[model samples]
Target chain A: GTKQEKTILNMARFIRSQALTILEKANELDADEIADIAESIHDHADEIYRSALARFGDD
Target chain B: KTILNMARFIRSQALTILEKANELDADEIADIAESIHDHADEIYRSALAR
Candidate 1:
């Protein structure tokens, strides 16, 4: 994979990791607004993953 | 809620700080970028810690 894609994938992974924790505690999230943030995070993850696979493969 | 918004604000604030830092010294761009990256890291952490 290209270095830029790798870097962005890694960064997105880090962001998704944080979002996962928030998902785990969705009930205690700051507000219902955060649900949108969580959803956005997942969407960003999907975008990053697609970019990575488009550049590399399913790897 | 407020925390998340505040975190977003801080991230933007950090970007503004970065721009100001650039004006002071273009050479400081790298350091400012790193600092902004760190701010992002902290914001994410703070968001999840809630």
Candidate 2:
């Protein structure tokens, strides 16, 4: 894959990692705070994945 | 343009900060992560509008 594609994939992975991390630690915080953080990372991951797909003309 | 590259760089920086989040806090990481995420989204939206 091209370097750009690789970068996007890595970003996607990183974003999802954040989401997972939040989930793992959710019990430490209130529900609203956890949801806000998780959703932020999750949405970012979706957008990055979509951008990667768009680069391939798949979206 | 190079928006994607810039976004990638920002995200990389955020990830680096995240690695030390144990020293920091979730709020701190969330602040940086939100910036990275929003900047990327901004670029993505602009590219779509092009």
Candidate 3:
């Protein structure tokens, strides 16, 4: 895999694993709480994408 | 498949938000937790139907 691919996969794995943690607390969350989590996930994803792109050309 | 995927995604995002528990009010966390749980149940039912 290219550096970009590797970075994306690595991030994906981390994010996916986080699902288990969330599931553990599933009995408890509201829309607003979920919304906050959704935002944080996007924020981290965006950070990973940009950092990867900056370090290794998209090509 | 799509519904299942959605559930998985929501679960992941919930975890992300939880990491910031200190940044959120307890009431907000409680609400979000219920939402996530409901969605998860929805996903499970949908998956079983398939």
Candidate 4:
């Protein structure tokens, strides 16, 4: 993949991981405010992964 | 087939980035975070275009 694609992929992976942690922590706190953004971040990370799967193939 | 091990690397790099990114200023971290969102938007737009 191109350099930009690599950068985005790296960033996406990073955000997704952080997002999951936030989601779990927010769950314990029962805080909808933080969970909403965490969910969104997680979604974006997932979408990016799916995109790469179809476009780039292979791991 | 083994699904994928990407998430493992994701967690690895994610943790290190946060711990070692102590040099990033407030604005820098914000920008980096936003970049992830924007990149996703870019990928979304590409998919929609086709």
Model 4: residues >4 Å from true position, as ranges?
Answer: A57-59, B1-50
Number of backbone clashes in candidate 4: 0
TM-score of each: 0.44, 0.46, 0.35, 0.49
Worst 10 residues of 4 chain A by lDDT: A50-59
- Model 3 chain A is weakest, by summed lDDT over 10 consecutive residues, at A18-27
Q: After superposition, how far is residue A44 of candidate 1 from its true place, in Å?
A: 1.4
- Evaluate every candidate with DockQ and list the scores: 0.05, 0.14, 0.08, 0.09
Best candidate, TM-score-wise?
4
lDDT by residue for model 3 (B1-50), tens: 24345445655655555555535554455455445445444443443444
Interface RMSD computed for candidate 3 is what?
11.4
Name the top DockQ candidate: 2
Q: What proportion of the real contacts between chains A and B does each prediction keep?
A: 0.00, 0.00, 0.11, 0.06
Clashing pairs in 3: A28-B33, A28-B34, A29-B31, A29-B32, A29-B33, A29-B34, A29-B35, A30-B31, A30-B32, A30-B33
lDDT of 1 by residue, A1-59 (tens): 54544554565555556545444444353334434445455455455445555656233
Q: Model 3 compared with the native: what TM-score? A: 0.35
lDDT (10s digit) by residue, model 2, range A1-34: 4555655666566666666566555445544455
Q: Which regions in candidate 2 have their CA more than 4 angstroms from the true location?
A: A57-59, B1-50
Q: Pick the candidate with the highest lDDT.
A: 2
Better of 1 and 4 by TM-score: 4
Docking class of 3: incorrect
Could you tell me the lDDT of residue A6 within candidate 1?
A: 54
Q: Write the per-residue lDDT of candidate 1 for residues B1-50, one digit (tens) a residue.
A: 33345445435544554454355453343254335446455544544453
i-RMS, every candidate? 13.5, 7.2, 11.4, 9.4
Which segments of candidate 3 are over 4 A away from where they belong? Answer: A1-36, A39-59
